[model samples]
Target: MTRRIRIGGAQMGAISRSDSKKEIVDRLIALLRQASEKGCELVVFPELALSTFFPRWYAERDGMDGYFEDGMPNAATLPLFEEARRLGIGFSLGYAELVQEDGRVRRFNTTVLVERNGEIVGKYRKIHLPGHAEYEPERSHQHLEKRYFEVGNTGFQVWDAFGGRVGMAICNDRRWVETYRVMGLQDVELILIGYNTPVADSESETLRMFHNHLTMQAGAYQNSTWVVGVAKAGVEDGHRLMGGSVIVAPTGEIVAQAMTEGDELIVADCDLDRCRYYKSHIFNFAAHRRPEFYQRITSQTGVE
Candidate 1:
């Protein structure tokens, strides 16, 4: 039997720092409705979908608490969950998570997969947190993700959902090969990634956008998996975020993409069986991989 799932990439425009949680949820619900109308069985949203990219500004830990969600599907976000269940659409969402664990308060850049039945299947915390922890006086803008969240303790993982093996990643994690390879080893068929990236860093907007898709496309083809990348695009609080959300096939081709940096929905039908040809032949890990020679990949942290 062919395992085919209709997926939607809900690319959101800029969200203001002044925007309330209720306003954000309303926008999410609207996009969810649009995906349902397009016959999508699963919808993927961008990272920090519930608020502005708060890491761009430096704040004390106590001052930043308001940006983190104490719990998923809390009073502020229940409507989105209820509506997805009503529409019978499964979805993945990214947000800031605040929790007390192992005797202290901890925060993370996290994402969750929710089933059509409204049950949460799994959660993935971002492992590759980009940017510096301390304030930089020379940069045009700050990227302080390192200061806001702890490195993810929950490693790369895949789950059985939507009739296939599914995995998730957030923002900067998509740029890493290990993020996809770890899940690929588990026979993952589809991976969902959400990002909030500035239009320019050390590179131009055009180059930054190219690098974004290039990394994701390479990951999809090399791992022989379907990749759905969604973004929070446009300008947020005067800082521009690039928007080039796309759905890539196992062949490394973009099947669907968003036209604007605003709120938009792009849909594509992904067949899990499409990964078989590559996985069993050209990119088959079991039959061709020489892992014993790649000791440096796991044993070293930097150049020898």
Candidate 2:
């Protein structure tokens, strides 16, 4: 298995709340077409890619359901799927997904991996939801993700796709080591992520982008897999977002990265086999056995 893959990160600009679904889809299609022209087999779009980071401002917003689609392949977003299929390019698309479950309407921050033929291969809902649920008028902007979206139902899992094992995760989910470790156990070769991270941080400005790249680099190196972190970046509706979308190798090196905050795409010729050496040696889970001592990791709810 050669496992040679060419991938790109679609670092989208702000899709403000005022933008129409058609407008957003048009931007996405252009990027998809450009990626295909660049000879990329796979493309990863940012989370909340269809709309602006709506959770940033909490209010009596009109047509809340408008942010979410009925499901993929619907009238609103059919063009994106159709365009990808025509180009023979697979992609991981992030959006606000609305679903009817157990007789109730549920909203989730979702990402889906579509095959080159436009068939959806797998879906991942965000588990690590960030920001507060309540509105804090004192802050510059309100981040009420906890109130807008429910915790993801799907657990961390990997699928056989793109001629290799692949996995999916959302913004905050990528920061957690467990997100990558679980997929690493399945021998995942690629991990795709989509995020809309606010650039402003009152806690620590220096640590914002630092923590962002650090977590990603460590996750790739430790898991021995290629990780693509794409962002819907730039100043969206008066808020700044981190726009450094990146593609990392198994050795924790960033092979390709986006420089601007607007819509940009960066490509990398990734040899999935690069993960083999690390997985078979230093990070070999099968060769390392200490689960008996890790009961606290599973049993404890929080660190004391």
For model 1, residues 1-304, the per-residue Cα lDDT tens digits are 5799999999998999999889899999999999998999999999989999999999875567798898997988999999999999999999999978889999999999999899999999999989998899899999989899889988898999999999999998989899999999999999999999898783487888889999999999999999999999988988999999999999899999988999999999999989887898778899898999989999998899
Error at 42, model 2, angstroms:
0.3
Number of clashes recorded per candidate: 0, 0
lDDT per model vs. reference: 0.93, 0.89
Tell me each candidate's RMSD, in Å, in order.
0.9, 1.5
Per-model TM-score versus the true fold: 0.98, 0.96
Q: Report the C-alpha displacement of residue 291, candidate 2, in angstroms.
A: 1.1
Where is model 2 more than 4 Å wrong at Cα? Answer: 60-63, 202-206
Alpha-carbon lDDT of model 2: 0.89
Please give, for residues 1-304, the per-residue lDDT of candidate 2 as tens digits: 6989899899999877789889999999999988998999999999988888888877543345778878876897898999899999999999888888999888899999999988999899999888888778778777888888889998887998999999999998888998998898889889999988888753364688788889999999998999999998888878888888999999999999999999999999999998998898778888885789988877986987
